[PDB]
Design a binder for this molecule. Structure first.
Ligand SMILES: [Ca+2]
Length: 639
């Protein structure tokens, strides 16, 4: 199931209008409180006018609206289930603006929701763009509109949440498809559940930022239910998805062909492992006792060139195990892995002990000391996040999490780890005064300006429960060693939530739940627009444009020349992200050293070390003197 975030508005004095309504299925049948009566558009005698079909509500007075629900006809007939849709709000009934929510609802008879940030409105409109099975009709048994108990205007300077993207699945895993710019998402064998899976199938969904279209695809070719997996983008531009509900399987997602390709089985069955792309484009993984068995699962390595997984049994998992009360089932999960110099992989946590992993021969592991500071030794931080915001300087920001996977209080702990050469123990210090809000199951992304956006989570880890939620995101600004609260959202994002950086410099945050008949499934995402995209006006800022790039593909150590429509102060490369269960081993940022050629022509060299400039797809962002970033130019980095 799911739930509204607000309280149902009394509909006593509502006036409603529909684009058309069959006699006996009048527009007002969707507001009579009777689940056995429904509105239905013209059919048979009246013709079958195709969608879009429209439901418009006049609530007579201004309400602090934060959602709607739509109950499909309950008579066992599928005709008129709403697929693609948009929700609009208005204070006048003529000027509707842009949708507050849009997307696609799953094809079934369950209550559907649009949950979105509070906005005072008197009128509400639901546009049914398509029928879920491609038929001409729209039907609705009951429509409700929900209110918050109050409204406060967002604070100037602190970003903005919205719109909502409605989805047919809970996006418990996600990736940017870098060649298309779309957001790829998946759940499990069902849109809302993983329990009871027979394996072999994954429901996926994509959202296209350019069109706003949400589509879906069932993936069976790879014989893989990809819930609870490792995820890495390899050097050959393929998303490598490992294990989970089918513990030994590898699925490959190829962005260029928009297709899934079977990969080699892993040597060890794994679930909840982290995998990390390496300096040579291969993918390393270790741990993962959620599935495939509970035992010591040492490293192994995937080669995109030979299409093999090779065991690295001497890359020992033991030194990175947390002291989780549930034991090995949890203690080898979600390692904070980062590909680094010369085929090495740094493991920054969640265990107190940090480690260097080595991929030559049959593998190795070397202690890198304890994550700590003058505040003391950092405790185990399961589902804490780790973000490499300056790969050139080896800088990793770590934060949050709890000593045990669940039933454990999260902390505000945050550290800066500074990587040097593999085999050396990195310096670690505390980050500012730590997080504003203790959280676990939170998610995070590095932004073009090197700040880290941190969102959602809860104070006490209770998977599938939306309790002790944190609604206020934070941004860490490294130059200031300071965290800043941002404007809060209204949708709980805890266990099974994701965040990814979008090519437009905004953040896509969604998911949470995946517990079947629970009411805590969130079939949606929201956009966060950082303050750097706004003028002091409160209007969206004018963005610099990248008018030319010398190339779209570059070797590490190589140069790129660009032209812009205005003078550029700073530039960065951000590697495209993948996300599930708090883990994102693909994102990282390289600040670029610009040569000014004059006439708004600029050059830069990609770092020569592929342990820094990890091969794969990257976003190029340029920022004007006002600190406003361009939209991303896509750059493939090769060896
Ligand atoms: Ca009804």
């Amino acid at each position: 199931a799911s739930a509204p975030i607000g309280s149902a508005i009394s509909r006593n004095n509502w006036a409603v209008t529909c684009d058309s309504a069959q006699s006996g299925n009048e527009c007002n049948k969707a507001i009579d409180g009777n689940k056995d009566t429904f509105w239905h558009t013209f059919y048979g005698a009246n013709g079958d006018p195709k969608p879009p079909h429209t439901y418009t509500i006049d609530m007579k007075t201004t309400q602090n609206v934060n959602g709607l629900s739509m109950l499909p006809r309950q008579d066992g007939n599928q005709n008129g289930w709403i697929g693609r849709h948009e929700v609009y709000l208005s204070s006048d009934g003529t000027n509707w603006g842009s949708p507050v929510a849009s997307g696609s609802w799953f094809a079934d008879s369950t209550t559907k929701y649009s949950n979105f940030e509070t906005r005072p409105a008197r009128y509400v409109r639901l546009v049914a763009i398509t029928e879920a099975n491609g038929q001409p009709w729209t039907s609705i048994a009951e429509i409700n509109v929900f209110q918050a108990s109050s409204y406060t205007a967002p604070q100037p300077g602190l970003g903005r949440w919205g719109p909502t993207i409605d989805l047919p699945i809970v996006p418990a895993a996600a990736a940017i498809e870098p060649t298309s710019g779309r957001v790829l998402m998946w759940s499990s064998y069902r849109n809302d559940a993983f329990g009871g899976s027979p394996g072999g199938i994954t429901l996926t969904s994509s959202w296209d930022p350019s069109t706003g279209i949400v589509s879906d695809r069932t993936v069976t070719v790879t014989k893989h239910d990809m819930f609870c997996p490792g995820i890495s983008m390899d050097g050959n531009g393929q998303i490598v998805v490992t294990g989970g509900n089918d513990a030994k399987k590898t699925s490959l997602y190829d962005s260029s062909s928009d297709s899934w390709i079977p990969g080699p089985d892993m040597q060890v069955a794994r679930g909840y492992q982290s995998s990390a792309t390496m300096s040579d484009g291969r993918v390393f993984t270790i741990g993962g006792s959620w599935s495939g068995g509970v035992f010591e699962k040492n490293g192994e390595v995937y080669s995109p060139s030979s299409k093999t997984w090779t065991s690295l049994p001497n890359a020992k998992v033991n030194p990175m195990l947390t002291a989780d009360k549930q034991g090995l089932y949890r203690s080898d999960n979600h390692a904070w892995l980062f590909g680094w110099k010369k085929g090495s992989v740094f493991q920054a946590g969640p265990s107190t002990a940090m480690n260097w992993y080595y991929t030559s021969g049959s593998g190795d592991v070397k202690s890198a000391g304890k994550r700590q500071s003058n505040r003391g030794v950092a405790p185990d931080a399961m589902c804490g996040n780790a973000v490499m915001y300056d790969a050139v300087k080896g800088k990793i920001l770590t934060f949050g999490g709890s000593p045990d996977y669940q039933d454990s209080d999260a902390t505000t702990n945050a550290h800066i780890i500074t990587l040097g050469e593999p085999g050396t123990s990195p310096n670690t210090v505390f980050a500012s005064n730590g997080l504003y809000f203790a959280r676990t199951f939170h998610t995070s992304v590095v932004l073009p300006d090197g700040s880290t956006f941190i969102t959602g989570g809860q104070r006490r880890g209770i998977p599938f429960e939306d309790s002790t939620p944190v609604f206020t995101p934070e941004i860490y600004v490294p130059e200031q060693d300071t965290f800043y609260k941002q404007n809060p959202n209204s949708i709980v994002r805890v266990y099974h939530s994701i965040s990814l950086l979008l090519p437009d410099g905004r953040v896509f945050n969604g998911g949470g739940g995946l517990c079947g008949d629970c009411t805590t499934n969130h079939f949606d995402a929201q956009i966060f627009t950082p303050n750097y995209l706004y003028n002091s006006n409160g209007n969206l800022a004018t963005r610099p444009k990248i008018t030319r790039t010398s190339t779209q593909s570059v070797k590490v150590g190589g140069r790129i020349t660009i032209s812009t429509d205005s003078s550029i102060s700073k530039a960065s490369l951000i590697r495209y992200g993948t996300a599930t269960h708090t883990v994102n081993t693909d994102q990282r940022r390289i600040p670029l050293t610009l040569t000014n050629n004059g006439g708004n022509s600029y050059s830069f060299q990609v770092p020569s070390d592929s342990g820094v400039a990890l091969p794969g797809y990257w976003m190029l962002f340029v920022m004007n003197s006002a600190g406003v970033p361009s939209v991303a130019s896509t750059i493939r980095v090769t060896q």
